[model samples]
Target: MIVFTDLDGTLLDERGELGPAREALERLRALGVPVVPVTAKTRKEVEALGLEPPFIVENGGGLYLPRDWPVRAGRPKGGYRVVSLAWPYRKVRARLREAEALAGRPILGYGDLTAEAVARLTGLSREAARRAKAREYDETLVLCPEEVEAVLEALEAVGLEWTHGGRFYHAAKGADKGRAVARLRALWPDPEEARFAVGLGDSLNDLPLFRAVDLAVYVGRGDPPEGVLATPAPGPEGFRYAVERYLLPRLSRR
Candidate 1:
């Protein structure tokens, strides 16, 4: 089975890395399960998460299967290949700007906004802003200095969607993780044979996995997208649940 996990607040803590989640990962790997980290994180960022997860859901991202992976995309099965693709960043930026104009605020670009800057704009207080810094999305664009409702309405008018994140209201156009899941699913045959998915997350960033997986697990203390299970504790506790509820049982059977 393929278990996709999230970093930061899920398996990893605020330090931007998972300290001992590997204990759970090792237990799973030993049982023949591949841990796929489905995240909104950039490749460079996941590297910083400190685990070279077997697969990644990255950059309006596509599936990154290692060159020697065993699964095959039907009839074309020989030596396996890596899958690479990214959402159109140019189009995303254009849409964000249009939404920003409608909102009467200069929408933020990825590089333009930072958690520190958001504090000044939102009056969340630097402490609050840092607490809400939704890392994966454009930090500045998602931040609404005063009126979040008005900002969301303006952004929606441009066909973009925003998700309330830990610290920011993340906005994106066609970068949905659900869309990425569908894309990856298309590339496999009997994908179910070697492919099954598990998702981990702390806050709102993990909502998309519910649309994409068979079983979804939320990592942090915050609630998951309705139906998905919120682990017994939070973060690593959720990771532990995945191991106990799914991985360990399967291992014992094997």
Candidate 2:
């Protein structure tokens, strides 16, 4: 079995801490069930968590597999093989500027902010914020509710894709979590026969992830996307419950 999870608001709590879900996560790891983080976070941010499994960063803009992993694709990088799925950061930034002009509204992106300012806005430590700022493929934006539609149109016109997360909007070129999941699954050994891919997330941006998995678990307060199961609680507690009640039991049956 394999688990694909969003980090913030799903596996981690509001403060970016894993909390109670850490135990359940370790349990899965102990059983050799790879729990891959599929997040909007950057490589530096995900690496800081010290997880051993492969991860998808920048909202599926990049996939990094450990050197020892069986997958044969991607270029060799620092102790891992990297598959890039989005435009270069400079290109993304330029497109965002174009979108901003087209929308006729001021758009605030992480690229325009200092690490300290990002830390204040996100409740992350200054060091953590610095890590978040080291973006490679996607750009994070601060959006105004009333300007959302206009911004969306502008981004579309500029040929950039967008997705909304818990606290910000993310833009990239051709980065889709579903596509990335499919790419990884295809490289796995008999993926359809041997792996049961379970996806868990808490926001609308995770919808594509849900479609890519065998089972989708939603860990949030509101209604879950169409057919996914919703946990009783929110954040790490909910994540723990979903793993223990849904995931473990299913694996045990297998």
Candidate 3:
């Protein structure tokens, strides 16, 4: 079994804390169930999230697997062995600029903002914002809701993929959490003769993640995605409930 989940608004509380989910995450490690955090957060941010090796970062644009990790899919990139799932950063950024021209407004991305500005945009600390700017494969930005379609079309014209999270719209070339999750699964054989995937998320960006997993759990506010079990509790509490009460029981039977 693999526990793949989003970070903000899914595993973390509204206050940006892991809360009870910390212990629950530890439980997965104890049980030997691989806990992979599939999120839109950058490698720097994902590293701060309490979890083990092999993280899917930049909305699945890149995957960082520790040296000792058994699964082999990608070559070395920077400090870790990475599965490069998206286009080069330069290409994505260039295409994004073209997209902005179509929108007729300045597309605000992390790279274009100062650390202080990023801190204001997101609730992250100043130091955190600095690390957030360390992008390798994707660009996350903001645009008018009405302009989203044109931006998407511009990206599409160049054969790119885009998705939005709770705050920003992400643009990359052929990158998505669903593909990243499935690729990881293919590398390792399931321990119990059957693989069980549990995905948890809170936003529309997580829609691809929901489709890739065996069971999808919604752990945030508002209406849930169809066919997924919606937890009345939100954030870490919802993450805890779904993992312990619902997911754990099912795991026992399997």
Which candidate has the highest lDDT of all?
2
Clashing pairs in 3: none
lDDT of 3: 0.80
lDDT per residue as tens, model 3, 33-66: 7778888888888776555557788787887787
Rank the models by TM-score, top first. Answer: 2, 3, 1
- Identify the superior model by lDDT, candidate 1 or candidate 2: 2
Q: How many clashes show up per model?
A: 4, 0, 0
Local distance difference test, per candidate?
0.60, 0.86, 0.80
Name the TM-score of candidate 1: 0.75
- 242: Cα error in model 1, Å: 2.7
Q: Local error of candidate 1 at 3, Å?
A: 0.3
- Candidate 2: worst 10 consecutive residues by lDDT? 186-195
> What tens-digit string does per-residue lDDT give for candidate 1 at 1-254?
66766665677655544665768877877877766666655554554455553445432344555454456532221232444444344555667778878988766644466757766665545654554443333333545467777778988898876764455556665555655565665554447743566666666666776668777777666456687776678777678777888667755563
Error of 1 at 38 (Å): 1.1
Tell me the deviation in Å of residue 167 in model 3: 1.8
